[PDB]
């Protein structure tokens, strides 16, 4: 339903005219941020040990309710390369990175644009960004750390961008540069969410502390915290199916003493976060929505006249139906 | 070499600072070397600077311990009392909550079992104020740390957990700031028992000094996990495990066998290091000997 609410809007031609926010993942080097984005997107963004996201990537996901068949494309500088298989995604994204950032461990401002259109993926915009380092290593220069922070601010400063702060459960949250960085650009936290990761790697004894953090009890966020567990590095090497990974996460929380609670509180798991985010997204649409009624109405009335002529025709079936949904929706949402 | 320091000790100074992030195990290192009960724990547990002055006795076979700050110079009559007392000091001085203070604590311990040494615990680096501290806490702390590591005497001991990508380590930057060529800098890795399975080769590299380079190079150890602190585990028992832990542990066996893992290694390592600076820093005290001699020439001038 409301998950297809957006497609209806896309049908009313207001998706261009109002598109709601993107979602950025900001946090330290190797804090699992690509792993979150991959977890939500179900697309193979490079995840790993060390320096693995080496320049910004926008992922534009679009649902298919009509043709139902896979699509994927990359774009940067000179190239708009076509990808003919989901298999190829990670391979290609690293091609892009090598090409663009220079094949070592240096990074670049230059954006990558992945656009994927599929049945299984949700309507969404996500943004991977490199991790915060505070020290240049191998072949990067002194001010790398700063370079990166500049690059990150340049995304989270936009009003559209929902900052998703990604922290591992095994670091004292007060260490978390990205929280400071977030409230800098979002003083009252209306586009900010805290994600904990690597819960499976906490020191035995310290799990109460972690819980508090997530019960939003040590550093306060307005929109509050989530916690998940992604593929550990072993599980990446073993190429584990996403669906299998999502399985474990459930098991993991389901049978984990301290953290059981956080699940039962709607505060753990990814499908939680997915849902959570959707509402976040859902809120912004609603806020924007009264200001598009003329487009929405005109459009609807323009479509109804188109299809009214095709009246008692079979070929209208698909769209005579499609319209229908749009209509019912609108009446109720407006009544709101 | 151990004796050269006793010849130096006989004539009555290098110190060693532990700098690193909040909950990175730094107090745990200093406790590991000192065998004294410095408050180590979850969250914010070193909440203002402490100088530990250790002095060997083969003479007395008597334990001694004293704390000092602001006014107080409190006597401690049992090693049992140390942690209790250090928290009393902290509460007294920093204000009970989570806020910190520049004000130094001075523990002086004299015992058989402890080495001749000077160590400095310092609070962890936070980058965000929580509960009852103010915005610029993070900076307050960094100022406080620089104020110790900037001295030439101070051997900066950077403490990193094995489960953070080393490039995240603020304290490394902070160290080269005040020690460009790395003649008083050592990297310690901790919590090796908390690495993600798969990433252990990476850790090793770090320690083989292969991802961020230090002149004096790296060590790695494992200290009481929080459970083991709640279970009050004997130090000697903890030192036992560390040996087991590395001894039977696949990737990290090597690092042991390379003299690059364990505490008794680090102890030995540091000792050599420490000796360097005495030899290095001695000319300034020959200068003070002048002062002493000229003050003494008054005694002879009086007769
Ligand atoms: N055990 C465990 N490991 C995890 C979890 N999430 C991620 N990891 C592991 O941590 C590492 C970091 O994940 P990744 O998504 O690559 O972090 P990243 O922030 O994207 C790397 P960069 O900062 O350069 O973008 C990977 O080795 C991954 O397998 C988790 O929940 N549990
Ligand atoms: N699992 C494991 N845990 C460790 C290790 N070293 C320390 N810890 C744990 O992490 C916590 C940190 O110890 P502590 O000495 O407080 O670190 P710290 O950096 O001095 C804390 P602060 O910054 O507040 O002064 C303790 O709970 C301890 O049990 C280790 O080698 N392995
Ligand atoms: Mg990444
Ligand atoms: Mg401490």
From Swiss-Prot, chain A:
Belongs to the TRAFAC class dynamin-like GTPase superfamily. Dynamin/Fzo/YdjA family. It comes from Homo sapiens (Human). Interferon-induced dynamin-like GTPase with antiviral activity against a wide range of RNA viruses and some DNA viruses. Its target viruses include negative-stranded RNA viruses and HBV through binding and inactivation of their ribonucleocapsid. May also antagonize reoviridae and asfarviridae replication. Inhibits thogoto virus (THOV) replication by preventing the nuclear import of viral nucleocapsids. Inhibits La Crosse virus (LACV) replication by sequestering viral nucleoprotein in perinuclear complexes, preventing genome amplification, budding, and egress. Residues 197-200 are annotated as: G4 motif. Induction: By type I and type III interferons. Isoform 2 is induced by HSV-1. This is Interferon-induced GTP-binding protein Mx1. Residues 128-131 are annotated as: G3 motif. GTP binds at residues 27-34, 128-132, 197-200. It is found in: Cytoplasm; Endoplasmic reticulum membrane; Cytoplasm, Perinuclear region. Residues 17-290 form the Dynamin-type G domain. It holds the Pfam family GED. Residues 52-54 are annotated as: G2 motif. Residues 291-311 are annotated as: Bundle signaling element (BSE). Homotetramer. Oligomerizes into multimeric filamentous or ring-like structures by virtue of its stalk domain. Oligomerization is critical for GTPase activity, protein stability, and recognition of viral target structures. Interacts with TRPC1, TRPC3, TRPC4, TRPC5, TRPC6 and TRPC7. Interacts with HSPA5. Interacts with DDX39A and DDX39B. Interacts with TUBB/TUBB5. The GTP-bound form interacts (via C-terminus) with THOV P5 protein. The GTP-bound form interacts with LACV protein N. Interacts with CCHFV protein N. The C-terminal GTPase effector domain (GED) is involved in oligomerization and viral target recognition. The middle domain mediates self-assembly and oligomerization. Transmembrane segments: none annotated. InterPro entries: Dynamin, Dynamin_GTPase, Dynamin_GTPase_CS, Dynamin_N, Dynamin_stalk, G_DYNAMIN_dom, GED, GED_dom. Residues 229-232 are annotated as: G5 motif. Residues 27-34 are annotated as: G1 motif. ISGylated.
């Amino acid at each position: 339903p409301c998950i297809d609410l957006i497609d209806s809007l896309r049908a009313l031609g207001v998706e261009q005219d109002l598109a709601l926010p993107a979602i950025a993942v900001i946090g330290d080097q190797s804090s699992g941020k690509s792993s979150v984005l991959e977890a939500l997107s179900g697309v193979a963004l490079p995840r790993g040990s060390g320096i693995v996201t080496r320049c910004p990537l926008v992922l534009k996901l679009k649902k298919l309710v009509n043709e139902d068949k896979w699509r994927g494309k990359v774009s940067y500088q000179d190239y708009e390369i076509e990808i003919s298989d989901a298999s190829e995604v990670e391979k290609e994204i690293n091609k892009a990175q090598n090409a663009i950032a220079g094949e070592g461990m240096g990074i670049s401002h230059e954006l990558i644009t992945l656009e994927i259109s599929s049945r299984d993926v949700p309507d969404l915009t996500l943004i991977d960004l490199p991790g915060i380092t505070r020290v240049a290593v191998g072949n990067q220069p002194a001010d790398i750390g700063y370079k990166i922070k500049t690059l990150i601010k340049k995304y989270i400063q936009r009003q559209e961008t929902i900052s998703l702060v990604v922290v591992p459960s095994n670091v004292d949250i007060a260490t978390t540069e990205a929280l400071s960085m977030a409230q800098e650009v979002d003083p009252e936290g209306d586009r900010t969410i805290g994600i904990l990761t690597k819960p499976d790697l906490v020191d035995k004894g310290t799990e109460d502390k972690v819980v508090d953090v997530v019960r939003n009890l040590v550093f306060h966020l307005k929109k509050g915290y989530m916690i998940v567990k992604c593929r550990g590095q072993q599980e990446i090497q073993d190429q584990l199916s996403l669906s299998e990974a999502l399985q474990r996460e459930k098991i993991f929380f389901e049978n984990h003493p301290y953290f059981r609670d956080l699940l039962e509180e709607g505060k753990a798991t990814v499908p939680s976060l997915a849902e959570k985010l959707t509402s976040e997204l859902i809120t912004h649409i609603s806020k924007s929505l009264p200001l598009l009624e003329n487009q929405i109405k005109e459009t609807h009335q323009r479509i109804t006249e188109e299809l009214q002529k095709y009246g008692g025709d079979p070929k209208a079936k698909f769209l005579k139906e499609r319209l229908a949904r749009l209509t019912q929706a609108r009446r109720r949402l407006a009544q709101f």
